[PDB]
Amino acid sequence: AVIPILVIACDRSTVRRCLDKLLHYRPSAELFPIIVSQDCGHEETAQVIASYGSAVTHIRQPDLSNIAVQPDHRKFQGYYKIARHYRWALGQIFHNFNYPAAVVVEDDLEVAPDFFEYFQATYPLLKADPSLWCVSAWNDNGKEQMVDSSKPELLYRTDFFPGLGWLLLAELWAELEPKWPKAFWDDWMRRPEQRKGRACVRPEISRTMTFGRKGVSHGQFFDQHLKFIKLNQQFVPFTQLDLSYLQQEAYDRDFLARVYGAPQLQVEKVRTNDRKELGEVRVQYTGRDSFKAFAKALGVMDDLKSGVPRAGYRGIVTFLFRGRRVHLAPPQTWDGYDPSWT
Template sequence: MQRKIRFKKKNGLLKYIKELEVQISQQQETYKSLVTKLHELESLGKKSDQGHLQEVLKTLESHKFPITKPKFLTRLSKEDSSRNDVVLPVLVFSCNRPDIRRSLDGLLKYRPDPKKFPIFVSQDCAHGTTAEIIRSYGKQVTYIQQPDQSDPIVPPGEAKFKGYFKIARHYLWGLTQVFRTFNHTAVIIVEDDLDIAPDFFSYFSSTYPLLSNDVTLWCVSAWNDNGKASLVDVEQGSPLLYRSDFFPGLGWMITKKLWDELEPKWPKSYWDDWMRRPEQRKERACIRPEISRTRTFGKIGVSNGLFFDKHLKYIKLNERPVDFSKQNMSYLVKANYDADYIRRVYSLPVVSAPDVRTNNVPFDGPVRIVYHTKDGFKSAAKLLGLMDDFKSGVPRTGYRGIISLFHNGRRIYLAPNSNWKGYDLTWS
């Protein structure tokens, strides 16, 4: 009898695969990558493979294929869905900031499940007061300490930037601990000077499947570099998410697979700008929100308050919680997103930055501002209150060179020509 059941399961599974392959072949180019996932199903039968089965099924279901799953697959999905929720640890990097209490209190306040979101605090600097505060949280956090307290070797002329060398070394050690020692499959990275929004955890847990399945993504970030209250849609923007070619940081998630790639070549300093280099990014994007899910209160630090008074303190922290588990994320898949986003942006009427600034546009609705040169971008960005710098040729929040903002109740896109050929490394 067991043999017959196995035979029926196998035949039902193969029939299911074949039906899906026929439908996929009729879809747009978007779905070609899913064929590979279908073949993965053929090898799934052992209990140890059921977690991967759930990931494949979720990917297929997100594209709304009108296929009735065999009963044993439906039952398996229900039985094992609770067992296969990925654990997403939060790694807090700290040094000598007693205000870490503010960050940890926020994380603990909004954390929905300690098992799904364990908190690791990695401390450098061996600062006694900060260490005592971290220890006071007991078993609510896992406290680890960077053992190497020696002075890093700094090139001539960069002695005043020694702190950046220590930070890069600490990141290497801390991330290695989470992925190698504790063997997690992904991590959410924050620093000890961040407040988080109430839906911080919902945001990351719901975008994780997208990150793990879309090879054109390499991170999810909670931060909008241009997220001032005057530049985002405070009323309707809470659920809005974007793809961005700019690595934002400040509350971000990566997978172990990416760390396998980055760890062997991790830099000695300036790790965030290193991440933004094309050799690391490899034309991959990050997901970022319209309204930030983190906000920094760290005016004093290694950067000596750079940008804080002029920009960072004005970043809007989301106050309207979104249950992202109920949001359809398929629009963020590259093929879907590019087709819709590019068509929408380049179909809009063109206006000038000065007219937008003075609200001198004689019609309602979204508009486009065109830039042709680096100076043209900077001029428009300054008029609109955007950050105007580039990293490896990429403007902050840019996607295919396009910046989305909200100003005076209107959606605006600052965009290059429609025949955009890619980022210019000299624009830095």
């Protein structure tokens, strides 16, 4: 299947780093055409993209005008521009070029060696399972000490849309475009009105890493969290593996049985590495305060978007802690996310 890589660029010449890695690992130019959509009009960045010649297709967002923002958004013009560019670029991919799907890659992302293999293998899953709405290369809790380096092939389902290197079908763009927001597109997709209970596939070890310390957003989130996500460097032949375990029917039975069948341990014992014979445990939280307290105690991202925790699935956040597999989970009576958990 032909799956274009849509690279979103603007005014950072470091799009070079992004393109160099994509082109180095690309297994087929025919199967993975690279389309670089550039906003802003920055000359140096345009020259960098143009220098790749026919290895990429360079297109330019046509409307470089300033955008009238709402009264609460004077400091956020950049986010309005990002949203406008996404709408135009995705429109080019799905309306002009008429591709069936696309992997969206921001210009400050470096991909892993098996980035293409991963999407080639998971595309069929996304096509077949309507309960999935994306495949993402990003593990929100993918810091080196929180992932199992011996399981680079392990994948999961997540209710938290990760973005940062993600595959979507033309069918999803059909649903999103008519109501595309003025700004903050990713948090908008995280709302239940958009997500509609759908999940994304995400890996144990991230297939992308960001180097965009300087960008539209102030660098604090990058400095405290994003910079620490470990990029996978061990090539996994995903197309040769049986990924049927990711189908909702199998996953919701097996993964959930696994989580709730695991012994429960108090957060303090997990933290101080007590009871090491229990290689897989569950740390149960019962409310917003305990979730944030326990997440923080174990070094897990503790913010919530529309009530969904980072990398969470049915409220469960799975990660490694000092070599132990941990599932920070709600009681099994869990029955939906509460957006008021902020």
